[PDB]
């Protein structure tokens, strides 16, 4: 019964993001920090639902908050990596006004495809209704969310970081270790934190429900390492 002991540990996630919260690229880190703040504050009470069902709208609130926060953080990381690639790939690049449009477009687009269907009756069969008196899903909405939130940006990140690594080797040879370590710390951390959750979600029988929540708890832990990494 040491859940309370670990609860205060997760409470430290808010402090780092609060302390973290200027340049053209530095504005994006505000969006990632803001998403972490929402995830840290909202998930902590909902995480302690373990001894339950506080209210009918309570299930709606957690469902509408968690999906939005996760997809927002993933999209913001994708945008940051795209900007970092764009900065060094093409010298003599050819704006704060553009950045404000970019940040607003990513966050609003992500929330629209997540918050609206969740409250718009997107679920399943005979077992699901009895839960109303488990975040069950149906109509491949889980498949769409997985392919549009955690699967799609991975290919783009892999491509851009491969391009950056290819350019770095070319720069080194022209002169006539650190790049591999830094790229590994930047990429493999997020990959190892998030791949298990998307893998388990798509597996939907053969998966125990009790262990299922454990993996989704790992993905929420990714918020803590977000401020220290950057």
């Amino acid at each position: 019964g040491m859940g309370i002991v670990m609860s205060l540990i997760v409470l430290a996630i808010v402090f780092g993001n609060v302390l973290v919260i200027q340049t053209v690229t530095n504005y994006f880190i505000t969006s990632l920090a803001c998403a972490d703040l929402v995830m840290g504050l909202a998930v902590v009470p909902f995480g302690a639902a373990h001894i339950w069902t506080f209210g009918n709208f309570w299930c709606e609130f957690w469902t509408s908050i968690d999906v939005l926060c996760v997809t927002a953080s993933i999209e913001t990381l994708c945008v940051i990596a795209v900007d970092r690639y764009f900065a060094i790939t093409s010298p003599f690049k050819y704006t704060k006004n553009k950045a404000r449009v970019i940040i607003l477009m990513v966050w609003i687009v992500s929330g629209l495809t997540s918050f609206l269907p969740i409250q718009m009756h997107w679920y399943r069969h005979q077992e699901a209704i009895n839960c109303y008196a488990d975040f069950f899903t149906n109509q491949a909405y889980a498949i769409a969310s997985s392919i549009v939130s955690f699967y799609v940006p991975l290919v783009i990140m892999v491509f851009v970081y491969s391009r950056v690594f290819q350019e770095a080797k070319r720069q080194l040879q022209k002169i006539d270790h650190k790049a591999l370590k830094t790229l590994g710390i930047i990429m493999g951390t997020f990959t190892l934190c998030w791949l298990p959750f998307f893998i388990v979600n798509i597996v939907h029988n053969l998966i125990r429900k009790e262990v299922y929540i454990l993996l989704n708890w790992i993905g929420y832990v990714n918020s803590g390492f977000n401020p220290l990494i950057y």
Partner: protein
């Protein structure tokens, strides 16, 4: 409140207009790049500007003034060692030739900042131009991205205007060392040119002066192993050719700063070096501040 309201409103409107104008202007300042030339006396720092600006940028009476000084130098040194023009014409024709051999004594003349701007498909480049050994104006040029150093290479024997001071090339080596270690210019890259290639080939080919004679420290008789000789270059000149560059690089490699050597002369060759200047856009890619 009649005076206060109208005046305050007009002042606010003027402030808004001026702030908008300044915000519009501040974008171009970040876009354009700045360079800065340097060098030594008679090095050739400003003559390349004529060939450089001919690429993308867009006196007769003054030129004749330096022409007269040419005649006086040979005649004056003889003792130690259009009526006017018509007589000088015979003097030019009459010019033993041993006076030319005394190169130890003492195309445009050697003359305020002369700023030149040229634009390309890439961002337009803005350059500056410049005795005074104090060099107290060097502060407040930390904003320049690169400093195009130019050093003579055909004068390893002549002397500076102050006669019997030091070797002409040696007077440039120590000057580069002083630039290298400075508090203000601690984050600036440097490009090197080795001008006057043609004269060097003419001088070394016909025997006469030996680098080993004027420079005793000439132990390196074998060129560096990773050598890419010029097409048809004689082996003897290449060892001389690479000797100058290595001497400069030793000071550079003694201690954020990345030095680049080159070879320049043929306006198109400088134009090829112009594309070479475009080709060297490495420094913006090079900073890579996000560790990587």
């Amino acid at each position: 409140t009649e005076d206060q309201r109208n005046e305050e409103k007009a002042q606010r409107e003027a402030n808004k207009k001026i702030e908008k104008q300044l915000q519009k202007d501040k974008q171009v300042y970040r876009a354009t790049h700045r360079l800065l030339l340097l060098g030594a006396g008679e090095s050739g720092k400003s003559t390349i500007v004529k060939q450089m600006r001919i690429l993308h940028v867009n006196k007769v009476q003054d030129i004749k003034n330096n022409l007269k000084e040419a005649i006086e130098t040979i005649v004056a040194a003889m003792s130690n060692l259009p009526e006017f023009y018509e007589h000088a014409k015979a003097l030019w024709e009459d010019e033993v030739r041993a006076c030319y051999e005394r190169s130890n004594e003492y195309r445009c003349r050697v003359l305020g900042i002369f700023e030149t701007k040229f634009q390309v498909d890439k961002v337009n480049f803005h350059m500056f131009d410049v005795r005074d050994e104090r060099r107290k104006w060097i502060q407040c040029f930390n904003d320049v991205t690169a400093i195009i150093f130019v050093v003579a290479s055909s004068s390893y024997n002549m002397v500076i205007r102050e006669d019997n001071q030091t070797n002409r090339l040696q007077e440039a080596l120590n000057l580069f060392k002083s630039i290298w270690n400075n508090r203000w210019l601690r984050t600036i890259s440097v490009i090197l040119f080795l001008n006057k290639q043609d004269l060097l080939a003419e001088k070394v080919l016909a025997g006469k002066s030996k680098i080993e004679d004027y420079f005793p420290e000439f132990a390196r008789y074998t060129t560096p192993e990773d050598a890419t000789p010029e097409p048809g270059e004689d082996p003897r000149v290449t060892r001389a050719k690479y000797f100058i560059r290595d001497e400069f690089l030793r000071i550079s490699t003694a201690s954020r700063h990345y030095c680049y050597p080159h070879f320049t002369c043929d306006t198109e060759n400088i134009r090829r070096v112009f594309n070479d200047c475009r080709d060297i856009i490495q420094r913006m890619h090079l900073r890579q501040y996000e560790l990587l």
